Amino acid sequence: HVGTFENITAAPADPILGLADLFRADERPGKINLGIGVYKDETGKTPVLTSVKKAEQYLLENETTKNYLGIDGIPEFGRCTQELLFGKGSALINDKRARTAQTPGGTGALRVAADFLAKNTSVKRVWVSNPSWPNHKSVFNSAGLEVREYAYYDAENHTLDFDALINSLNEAQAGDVVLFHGCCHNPTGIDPTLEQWQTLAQLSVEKGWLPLFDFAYQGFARGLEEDAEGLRAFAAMHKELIVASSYSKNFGLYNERVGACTLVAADSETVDRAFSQMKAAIRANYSNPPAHGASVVATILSNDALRAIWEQELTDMRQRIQRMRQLFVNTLQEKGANRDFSFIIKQNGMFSFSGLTKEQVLRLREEFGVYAVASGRVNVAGMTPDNMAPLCEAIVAVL
Amino acid sequence: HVGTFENITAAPADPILGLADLFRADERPGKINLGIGVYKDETGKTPVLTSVKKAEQYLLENETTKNYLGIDGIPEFGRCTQELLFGKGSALINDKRARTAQTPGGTGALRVAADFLAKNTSVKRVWVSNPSWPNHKSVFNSAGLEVREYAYYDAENHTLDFDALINSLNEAQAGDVVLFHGCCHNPTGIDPTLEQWQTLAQLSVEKGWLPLFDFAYQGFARGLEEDAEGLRAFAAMHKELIVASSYSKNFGLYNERVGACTLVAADSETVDRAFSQMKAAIRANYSNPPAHGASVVATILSNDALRAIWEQELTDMRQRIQRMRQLFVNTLQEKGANRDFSFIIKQNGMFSFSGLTKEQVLRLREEFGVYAVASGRVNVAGMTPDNMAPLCEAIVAVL
Ligand SMILES: *Cc1c(COP(=O)(O)O)cnc(C)c1O
Ligand SMILES: *Cc1c(COP(=O)(O)O)cnc(C)c1O
């Protein structure tokens, strides 16, 4: 008998995670990693946060069992998540209109939402910004949903093309899903203003879209509450919406897989009925979620002393990134760059489109050992005072 | 505009995991939970293993980052898994014919296999035993695969109906998947003898089946090496197979979601090509796996001192369950049962497949506060010297 595996074609490498493999194998001591969206401190390391180490020590000494969690995970984790998203005292919470499942990362929350939609509703299409995180299309396609693109970025002016966005979204039908990044758009770092969020919200209710927010960077633009203003404007108007959030980055808990999928419906009866099918889709995927990382998050957010430490550590990360953006722009001019790079200062989060071509990005890797994503996305949080000069010298050399 | 969630039909509660909610709600003193397949010690608790606590302390002291794992997880965890399944010195390992991905539990391993098969192969059908773990059908159906049932249990003699198993797999075609439980069949506790495994291995290769082993209880039947004899008989004859394994039960790590999906192909070039598509399926689901639980397992298995402690803790679990099986049968007799329950002594693993009707299971719950699965599956590892007498008085009353 001829093998079931014999004719499988090899998959292409992941445009983000495959870069990490290349970078690890590179033997040059001066190599610089500006690819995957992981925070680095001023020393070039990705430490465990102190708030997280303290919570892990508490868990080690007080955990008495590893018995399965419920399908939807730790109850306090879900309550804390809804407060962060919608704010204490939200009507969504007091009206009992939201349900939250703890999930393995924000990616797991996206896939659970996608599986839930494909198997229990009439949804067929998901609209995603052009550009967006490369894995969005793969997640939704693998659940059986079609992915469509709406305009977003003006590469000439390095801004949000708001007229193009609205014009292209006038093709999205009632009952389509439209995906928004909550803040720190990946990869452009360009977010709507509050006014623009409010225009999109009113339009959304008018056209009958089902909003789906990918919220992986709460706290990295302006602040925890400020970064949720856009979501909270949608939540004020809509009967229905979905939020896939991640604690990977704002808690530095990447590899423990901590995220949440939050369902909102018009009333308590409908959301409980829908959440019953969300739980069924989870059960047929990974059964129930991993406890360690989510237990850490719930411990930190439940304890005023740990939460105050964590909030300061998040502010420090946010502010260090802002300092590197300015240093990056200033150092490019000193190293001989002709172009104006000041638009970098206007972008939020870890990421920015550098304006570099695929050929230039390739040269940076092969000739200078500087690793960026082929789209020209660079991770500013991977820049340090010590690697800024060689990094900038390399960019000027390929311009 | 009509809501997207209005037309949703509620899902029923899980036949196993829903029991926890029903049991927690029950206010009657002395209620007994014989439902979900977790181990309990002599005091009715599910403690963290000492070997696990020691490993967690080492990780707390030595972890310096939570940076993402690769898509397939901790390399050392994969190597230790293959040695455990196939044996040190296995030709499958020496010839590099196996690749392993760390997954979120055994369930996650089954789902990754299902998504991989549906996307990349001509597999259309999966054969599972009647009875089986109820979530098998849900996992494979979630990828759009047809699930058929083969005969397995002789409810009259409380044995394996080997003639009917053979006859009922007659219509399983080349390229169909046939799912086998590695040991401690869930729910029956009846496993093939070595002679029966060898017969099935030869038949499988003559008919061209793709075997898939679900290995959730290695070490709970007779021992770690002994429980793998059937898989190793298959592995000696087959070019291709898949193993989904779990460390939830034999390490007591249920809620940290520690499992593995192992792919075996004819040669290194083929398995690497197929594995690249399995990694693609993981990336579009939960991206990469949770570190904490798998790090514990890898630490324990790669340290001779910790591994010896763990192997003794697993022996202690196995022996307590065997003692309770015998006490259960003796006490049923003491309490006046006229039905012969001696077949329970011949079953393996955490459970006894008692033959009680759905009607009798509902009556135990509602009238005596004793909780079993509606198939009549009872968790022997939930029995203690303190609850055995009332448990048996209740069963005798509904007979
Ligand atoms: C990081 C990221 C994710 C994935 O989050 P994980 O928790 O690592 O799975 C999803 N969407 C966006 C935009 C991200 O930046
Ligand atoms: C427990 C069990 C599983 C699931 O294991 P998890 O690690 O909890 O996902 C799968 N198959 C069988 C037969 C089981 O008994």
Q: Which two tokens stand for residue A123?
A: 């949804």
What is the residue-wise DSSP string for A68-84?
Answer: PPPTT--HHHHHHHHHH
Contact B284 A9 (CB under 8 A): no
Is A105 touching ligand 1 by the criterion CB < 6 Å?
Answer: yes
Is B133 touching ligand 2 by the criterion CB < 6 Å?
Answer: yes
According to DSSP, the β-strands at A259-264 and A241-246 are antiparallel
| Cα gap A34→A19, rounded to integer Å | 10
Helix or strand or coil: residue A210?
strand
| Cα gap A170→B30, rounded to integer Å | 62
3-state secondary structure A291-355: HHHHHHHHHHHHCHHHHHHHHHHHHHHHHHHHHHHHHHHHHHHHCCCCCCCHHHHHCCCCEEECC
Is B247 touching ligand 2 by the criterion CB < 6 Å?
Answer: no
Give the closest-approach CA distance of A125 to chain B in angstroms.
13
Contact B317, B307 (CB under 8 A): no
Q: Is A318 annotated as a binding residue?
A: no
Q: Is B310 annotated as a binding residue?
A: no
Cα–Cα distances in angstroms (integers) from residue A172 to residues A123, A148, A251, in the given order: 12, 9, 35
CA angle, residues A303, A250, A209, in degrees to nearest 5:
110
How far out from the chain centre does Cα A45 lie? 21
Q: Is B133 annotated as a binding residue?
A: yes
Give the closest-approach CA distance of A28 to chain B in angstroms.
21
Helix (H) and strand (E) counts in chain B: 14, 13
What is the residue-wise DSSP string for B274-303?
Answer: HHHHHHHHHHTTTSS--HHHHHHHHHHHT-
If we measure between CA atoms, which residue out of B275, B260, B63, B61 comes closest to residue A254? B63
Minimal-distance CA residue to ligand 2 atom 12: B216
If we measure between CA atoms, which residue out of B347, B358, B355, B297 comes closest to residue B325? B347
Identity at A213, one-letter amino acid code: F
CA angle, residues A68, B48, B181, in degrees to nearest 5:
55
Contact B68 A38 (CB under 8 A): yes
Q: Is B377 annotated as a binding residue?
A: yes
Cα–Cα distances in angstroms (integers) from residue B183 to residues A47, A349, B215, B222, B303, in the given order: 42, 50, 7, 9, 26
Identity at B174, one-letter amino acid code: A
What is the residue-wise DSSP string for B85-101?
Answer: HH-TT-HHHHTT-EEEE
Cβ neighbors of B363 (< 8 A, separation 6 or more) are B398
Is residue B197 annotated as a catalytic residue, yes or no? no
Resolution (A): 1.8
| Cα gap A37→A249, rounded to integer Å | 8
| Cα gap A340→B35, rounded to integer Å | 67
Is A78 touching ligand 1 by the criterion CB < 6 Å?
Answer: no
Cβ neighbors of B182 (< 8 A, separation 6 or more) are B213, B214, B215, B216, B217, B218, B227, B228, B230, B231, B243, B245
Contact A252, A47 (CB under 8 A): yes
Ligand 1 test: best mutation among A246, A297, A348, A373, most atoms within 8 Å of CB?
A246
Helix or strand or coil: residue B102?
strand
If we measure between CA atoms, which residue out of A366, A370, A361 comes closest to residue A392? A370
| Cα gap B101→B71, rounded to integer Å | 8
Question: Dihedral (C-alpha) B238, B244, B249, B253: value to the nearest 10 degrees?
Answer: 140
Residues 213-242 of B with CB under 8 A from A: 239-240
Size of interface A-B (CB pairs under 8 A): 261
Cβ neighbors of B170 (< 8 A, separation 6 or more) are none
Q: Which two tokens stand for residue B183?
A: 């040991």
Cβ neighbors of B62 (< 8 A, separation 6 or more) are none
HSE-CB of A285 using CA atoms within 13 angstroms: 28
Helix or strand or coil: residue A98?
strand
Cα–Cα distances in angstroms (integers) from residue A371 to residues A22, A27, A34, A362, A397, in the given order: 9, 13, 5, 9, 15
Which atom of ligand 2 approaches the CA of B217 most closely? 15
Cβ neighbors of A242 (< 8 A, separation 6 or more) are A113, A177, A210, A211, A212, A213, A261, A262, A263, A264
Give the closest-approach CA distance of B139 to chain A in angstroms.
5
Identity at B137, one-letter amino acid code: K
Helical axes B50-62 vs B304-334, angle rounded to 10°:
150
Identity at B191, one-letter amino acid code: D
Contact A284 B67 (CB under 8 A): no
Give the closest-approach CA distance of B396 to chain A in angstroms.
30
Which uninterrupted H or E stretch holds B214?
Answer: strand B210-215
- Describe chain B by its helix, strand, coil percentages, rounded to 5: 45, 15, 40
Helix (H) and strand (E) counts in chain A: 14, 13
Residues 74-103 of B with CB under 8 A from A: 103
Is B168 touching ligand 2 by the criterion CB < 6 Å?
Answer: no
- Which approach determined this entry? X-ray
Chain A positions touching B214 (Cβ under 8 A) are: none
Q: What are phi and psi of A268, to 5 degrees?
A: -65, -40
Chain A positions touching B14 (Cβ under 8 A) are: 71, 279-280, 283
Contact B212, B127 (CB under 8 A): no
Q: Is B62 on the interface with A (CB under 8 A)?
A: no
Cβ neighbors of A94 (< 8 A, separation 6 or more) are none
Cis peptide before B104 (omega within 30 of 0): no
| Cα gap A121→A218, rounded to integer Å | 29
Helical axes B291-301 vs A291-302, angle rounded to 10°:
130
If we measure between CA atoms, which residue out of A349, A356, A393 comes closest to residue A372? A356
Is A189 touching ligand 1 by the criterion CB < 6 Å?
Answer: no
How far out from the chain centre does Cα A53 lie? 23
Cis peptide before A187 (omega within 30 of 0): yes
> Per this entry, what is the length of chain B?
399
